[PDB]
Amino acid sequence: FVTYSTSEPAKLFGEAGRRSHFRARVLEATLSPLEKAIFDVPIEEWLTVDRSKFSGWRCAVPHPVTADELKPVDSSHDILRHIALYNGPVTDLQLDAIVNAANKTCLGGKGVDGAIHAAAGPLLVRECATFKGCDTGQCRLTKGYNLPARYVLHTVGPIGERPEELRSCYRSILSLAHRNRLRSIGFCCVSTGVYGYPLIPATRIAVDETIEYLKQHFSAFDLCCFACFKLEEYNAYTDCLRAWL
Amino acid sequence: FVTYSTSEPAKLFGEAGRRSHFRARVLEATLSPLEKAIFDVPIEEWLTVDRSKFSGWRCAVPHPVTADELKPVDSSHDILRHIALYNGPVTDLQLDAIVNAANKTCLGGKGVDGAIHAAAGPLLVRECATFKGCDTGQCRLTKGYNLPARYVLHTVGPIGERPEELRSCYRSILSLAHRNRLRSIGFCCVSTGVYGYPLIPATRIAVDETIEYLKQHFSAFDLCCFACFKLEEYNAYTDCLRAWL
């Protein structure tokens, strides 16, 4: 078997040119009047506008899930009344923001990242192309475009099992949402999955940081929802929350 | 609104470290005995083995589509009896190979690339990590693992509308499949979609190269199938094939 269509290169060198070239093509593309109208809404204004007034805006989710439909893990508990689990994709959630597990370029990728870009539509990556990427453990904020949610919080988790970098992601998301007075957030499972942060330790950290933030800042959030696409993820949160209790 | 969780960096610099680090974590991971058994099958041997004999192998597609279920565009025509269209994901196809629209690193990404890695399972990226990426217009061959198809042909199409680079992809895929005596190939729509190669010109090229290969090499293939996830794509092939006739 031959396994490549030409001679092998001198060594591995390709990658960063593709991404800069993609970023360049995204920035250079001509937006329609429909798209431009949506794209120019100032970011802070997007929270509250009526998005149906733009013919370019087509909600990507047929039946979005609103905050009133998300039951907390314990309505009696002073902290855990602000926490809910959703057994489905984070893109269903019509909240102030959802979290995207991004990479340093913020230009899309596999997994939840690709799902979010696909639901939000082409303007999401256009907004991401305009800023200088995202560092590991930090968070960027954009509009959510065709998402039911208003904003996306793009964070960059660690590749491996680096507890202090993943902690930082949760800290950055929570502080940035709070700074902008966003009151409901839908999380995805940052850094988990194939070759990533093992599920239970990751979930431990997510739960621990989010509860610590809620304890220390009474007035910050109405709801933090952990969207758990897979049943395994849902059960990890359930166990960690029960183990936290 | 604050849109980033810390100070802006001096300039955009991050990206290539993440990918090399991901590649490193993939290569360093310990395979199970089940996985190792599958992974060590020599590539040329994989075509013909009985994959059900490995407990690690779980076909990712419940009801795969075999070549006998793929009707050609014209059974009377000497060339077009070897061409079929499928209105569904390329991952359904149980053929000798399917084509992945990859990036230069071959480590996964958005779109069909992510779909293929997800269906094939974690060993696909492990095999990709072992080689020196893929150049634009060239093609790499790997085993397909949990895919119904035996192999994956990872090509790197151009980002923009570069006809000679996309031609090269089709030429590389076709010549590499033929060199290895693979006789049935499932294509995806290389380089198309948001910010990419416009659909009709891309499809023109795919059709033109594939038919030219079939004309010149009578004995190469039994079937080339264009998997068209979206109806728009299906109609583009139908029009190009009809326009070729």
Author numbering:
A (entry chain A), B (entry chain A): 13 to 257
The authors write:
Crystal structures of TbMDO were determined to 1.95 Å and 1.2 Å resolution (for crystal form 1 and 2, respectively) and crystal structure of TcMDO to 2.0 Å resolution. Structures of TbMDO and TcMDO comprise residues from 11–261 and 13–257, respectively and share a highly conserved structure (RMSD 0.84 Å). The N-terminus of TbMDO and TcMDO also pack differently in the crystal. While the N-terminus of the TbMDO folds back to the core and extends the β-sheet, the N-terminus of the TcMDO packs to the precisely same site but in the neighboring molecule in the crystal. No complex of ADP-ribose with TcMDO could be acquired but comparing the TbMDO-ADP-ribose complex with TcMDO revealed that a loop aligning the distal ribose binding pocket adopts an open conformation, indicating that the ADP-ribose binding pocket at this region is not preformed in TcMDO. The observed open conformation is unlikely a crystal packing artefact, as there are no major constrictions caused by packing at this region of the crystal lattice. In addition, an identical conformation for the loop is observed in the apo-structure of human MacroD1. The larger enthalpy drop in TcMDO could be due to the open conformation of the active site. In the open conformation, the loop near the distal ribose is unable to interact with the phosphates of ADP and might explain the enthalpy change. Also TcMDO contains proline in this position indicating similar binding mode of the adenine moiety as observed in TbMDO.
